[PDB]
Amino acid sequence: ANPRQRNKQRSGKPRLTRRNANKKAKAKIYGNFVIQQNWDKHATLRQNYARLGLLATPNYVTGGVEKLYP
Amino acid sequence: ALKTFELRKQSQENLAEQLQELRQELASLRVQKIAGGSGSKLSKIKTTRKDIARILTVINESNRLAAREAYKNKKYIPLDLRQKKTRAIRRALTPYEQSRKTLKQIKKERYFPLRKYALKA
Amino acid sequence: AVSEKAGHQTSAESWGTGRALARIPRVGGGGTHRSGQAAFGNMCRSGRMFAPTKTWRKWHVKVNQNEKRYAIASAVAASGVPSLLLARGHRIEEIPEVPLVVDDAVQSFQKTKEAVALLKEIKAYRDVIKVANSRKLRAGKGKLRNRRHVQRRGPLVVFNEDTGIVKAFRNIPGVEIVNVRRLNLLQLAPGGHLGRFVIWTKSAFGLL
Amino acid sequence: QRYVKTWFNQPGRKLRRRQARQTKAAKIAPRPVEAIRPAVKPPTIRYNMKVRAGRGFTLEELKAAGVSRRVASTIGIPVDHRRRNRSEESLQRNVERIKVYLAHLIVFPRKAGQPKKG
Amino acid sequence: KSHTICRRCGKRSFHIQKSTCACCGYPAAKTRSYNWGAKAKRRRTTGTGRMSYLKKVHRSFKNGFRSGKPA
Amino acid sequence: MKFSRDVTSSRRKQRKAHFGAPSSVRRVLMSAPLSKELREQYKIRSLPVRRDDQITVIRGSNKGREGKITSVYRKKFLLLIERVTREKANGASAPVGIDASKVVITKLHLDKDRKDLIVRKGGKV
RNA sequence: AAAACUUUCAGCAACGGAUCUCUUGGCUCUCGCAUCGAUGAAGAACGCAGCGAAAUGCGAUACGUAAUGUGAAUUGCAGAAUCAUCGAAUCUUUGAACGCACGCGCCUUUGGGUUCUACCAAAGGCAUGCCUGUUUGAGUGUCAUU
RNA sequence: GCAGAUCUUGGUGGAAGUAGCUUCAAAUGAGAACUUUGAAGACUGAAGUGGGGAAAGGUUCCAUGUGAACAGCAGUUGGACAUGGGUUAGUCGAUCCUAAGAGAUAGGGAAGCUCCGUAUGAAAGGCACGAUUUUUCGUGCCUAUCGAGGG
RNA sequence: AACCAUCUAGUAGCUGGUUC
RNA sequence: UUUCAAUGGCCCGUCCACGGACCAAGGAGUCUAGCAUCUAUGCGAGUGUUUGGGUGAUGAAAACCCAUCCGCGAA
RNA sequence: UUGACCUCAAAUCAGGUAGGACUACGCGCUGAAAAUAAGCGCAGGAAAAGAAAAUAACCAUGAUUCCCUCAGUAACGUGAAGCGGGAAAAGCUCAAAUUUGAAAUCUGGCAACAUUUCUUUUGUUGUCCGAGUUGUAAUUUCAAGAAGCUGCUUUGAGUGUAGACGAUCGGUCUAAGUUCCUUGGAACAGGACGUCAGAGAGGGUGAGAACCCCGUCUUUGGUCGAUUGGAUAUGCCAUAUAAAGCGCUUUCGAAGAGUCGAGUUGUGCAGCUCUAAAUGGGUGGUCAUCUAAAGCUAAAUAUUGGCGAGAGACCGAUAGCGAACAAGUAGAGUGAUCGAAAGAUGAAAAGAACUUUGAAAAGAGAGUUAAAUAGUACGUGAAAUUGCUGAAAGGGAAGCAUUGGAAAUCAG
């Protein structure tokens, strides 16, 4: 609508298409090599920390927990 | 269509004259158009008009590379040769200057840096 | 919502009463086809619409969490009445029994041939064929709006753990796979009409 | 009833913050996402019967617990130069908060500086 | 006549007697554009011309303003 | 189902992209299938068309005809094949274009630029 | 009670552009990112294709040049591409606009002419406010020198 | 969800075909009351319906072709469009100057866009001399700018 | 004083219309 | 359906007056916050998850789960 | 006679920097008929705020911002804040104390040596000039701290190599009918027979295409790059004659002025008049709490603008942006400003050869096509409105209603 965006609508120059979006942008782990091997690129960080035996936080979790089995 | 790799290994005055030649036919080629010419000659105007551009590009690349080498390792070099990123990028603190710390701040992170630890469970 | 800057831009005010013309704001200037023409009112061409649509409508509706859970339990129970399944529209006259449970080895599938193979053995494949032949182009403006096609609803596969069951059953037209722990109403009661045909893996049933 | 704040970005703010949590700890894996906070008493008559997380452990809490101010911020124990223990109850509740922390902590060794001579 | 061609904005708004264009206020170093004139802003603002340099910059940002030659 | 946020399934944006494709991208939208004997001894399924390639028209009113392509008319997504033509009123012969998906390829124009591609796309030569 | 004229009905034709179906456009939401300029920006004016007036691109290297990528076109007629990519360049007159004005000068170097103490051309220069430094200074400012 | 809003936008009627708005011969041309030539007769009667300029306009100038839009009629017509051509300066003007004034600067106001100020408590422009003077300059003199009748 | 775009969909106790 | 005869029938809206040449499309009690009543649903001395945290691989702005508080009621 | 300085100049002096634009969100200032609009100044990807001259009256809390709650409460129709729940968390730097057994500090010139998004970037080393004692470094920041004594525990502003691991830019690889029968100009349709599916999203192709084509899934990945983030292993240098934490004290503890504040005036701040102190001063309820008049700082937070994406119970050409099209365009006004209308031949121009009449425009034959009831005045083509044809009625109204005849037409 703006003249600026009308310029490249009536222009012939191709856009600067930048391909960025990733559903579930779960950031992969660097830093410690031990954890990076035994990370689960699908499961969440609070699951992975509890899987390894690492306290994700020392302070109480301000919401619910995950209970999959009775 | 003069190949650029052939041109760029020539000499300066050799390129200067070929440019001098390249004006003549293009000057003559337009003269035949106003006086009437054939399709092949009319198409040849465009090819020569790019062939002037190819030679002139080669001269400048040679001329500026001479300045770049002649000015290599000097404190001040011509503005047309320096970085042209952005006025704000050029006036911002260099990483060396942003990295600078007081001697007190070098003792703090020397004897007491951030540790790597782990909470068991 | 329409633009809140719509109708507001083009300038005009009332010409005055007693000139054999209605008193609408009529654009000024000259030499253009637009001049001397009215706007600002829903009744004029290129005129602001009456009560322009706002974005702070009430789009989402709060529901008591308990009646949400009552609804799921009711729709799950209706999923186990064969008669309610037939009115919902599921061709399950040859289904072995209701609720249709399957072995737990189904949760580890790896190919859509296996998925289709199993469905044919339990005679639920009459329902995948129904939702395949019904595939019709949409009627109306919906197809102009990334809603190109419509079709029916197939059997609802419910599992307990995912290891490849979803990746096998998902491409079949009509079939939907849902974890037992996150049972959804839009799939236990499409359109609000009860009794969708469900298929329970052995563990998923034991976890109800 | 002029300019309105409409919350259509509430579900996307929920994930933006989840990804920020994911991005953060992935940079500092072995260590927890958050620091340890003390347990403090709210400052009122409607709330003094409850316990809630503080801002950090005072100078005396760390001194008795066995960490100095400089090495307590490295291993992730925030300090609170404002707060102070007016009674022995708060001292003991938070001294033994750091005691369980220092027991569950694995401080990895760093790189030393060894000059060729003395 | 009362207005001739302004040199900065090209419109014949340059009042000879005041020696100041009504459209853009030349020769003040700034440009005349008021907020109540929102249409007047859009008629002239960035984007109604070539933008030969900003298109250069926006193109060169994607790769990080690199300088040099490919290996 | 496109599980990616990377690609658009908007109809509006897919038609704009098709009809705003540059020649270096139209060159891919103009692919053609390979005939059975070509397909099995090159282990490749299709190929973008190239001038001088020999094709046979599969579908249309010119069904079953063969010929050599004269020019892959890329602006309007058409292929002009030799000795297939329509007769104008005055007596001129203006060839009509067939679409690259309605023709099959029975003979290629092998070049060292094409040979690398064939082994590039999981083939053999 | 004939024909015309007027009116109504039907058929055809005209006028007109409704309805329907469409739709590279709008609007609304969400998401990601931070990048203009004295190294001349935004904007303005002129100009360029074999045949272009618009629009696009571009700057006397003018619908482009170099580089890399793809691998045979362009199309309306008469190592390609009215291609992509973009780390190299070119970027006319202007514009904060900057030698002075809206044409006239000064400064340093270089060149030309079958004309050389004349003439001409060319390239590079000359805005203001401020900061660090430099050199040249001013002062019945302060003071020293047997 | 429309019969109305002196409704909006577009189309369309009646009113209405209503109100209304020099002559001869010859040649060209498919076509002559409006074209061309000759022929007579008129009109303007030098304060021209004449011939030139200034601003202004911008190509309207000229050639050729056309008769789609313009033409209160028509045209074989035009300032119409189509297609080309045309303005040559040492001596003619501008560029050179100032007038009334505008007016940057030195300054001073102003929260500020800005304002005042131009002779103003401004260090505000160069000339000559000399065996070369400690091989480090000594001595002596004088006190903006735009703007059209001037050339 | 006039004009221009805004404030602005300014102000209504009133006029006119308000669809099966 | 068209016409004919017999009988009948003042031009519509509005408040005489004002509007109406004809036609097609457009065109006016809408969205939203608070309160009040009524009916329905869920629960019941309780009740309300959607500020947040968890979780969701298949439409992940949906669904699903929950800690501390807090609102109203319980004098 | 010669020189130190102090202040002030000049230079096309060496090197630099400022201006203008955009302005959705930021911070000011000014300000109407709401601390609003308009005006003015100024920034950044965020800005601002920010490590208490803070609350509270407790079993006390502990920078800032933001959300919920507090709460339509308190105070005076306006309209709080603390506490409470959350999101995020990170702290710090100067001035004021003698380095006095050593200005330990820094800009610049030149000379080298490396490094590089980079011949474009960035430094180190030496060396000379200066800056600076009217104060540049080290040390200290009230949470303290310094100086001693003590005895335990610690240490790189390095540089190569190597591999793993994330981040970006570009290139690159991808399953299965185009098999028969009828319809049609066209098979993408109907039926038959099959396949693929981690792919049955969407689009293209002469009509509804998972299997013709591009893609989609695989991909939360293989591959060749090109730059890079931070760790790990290992090599080479290293100023350690040092620097730092914590016990202890027979020692000391500097703390911001025309500012706080009092009087008055303009709407907490500001102007004028006057003008402080050191257990002092500020703010609360004699106690409590904070320690102003100097400084910096991520994240959570805002985002109608910018660069891109992905959507939608949205609009569908009088709608939706003013603009689906050569739209801020034609155009209008001296000017500021204003500012439109206009989408669709067909699968493919195959845009109507040729003859004939006409000066031309065109017509009539033909011809193209599935179709010219598609001929560019081009999809469909309504109503008003008009022309002809046929029927009917009409003597200063018509229109309509009920009942039947006449003619027309339909059914069962």
Ligand SMILES: [Zn+2]
């Ligand atoms: Zn101007």
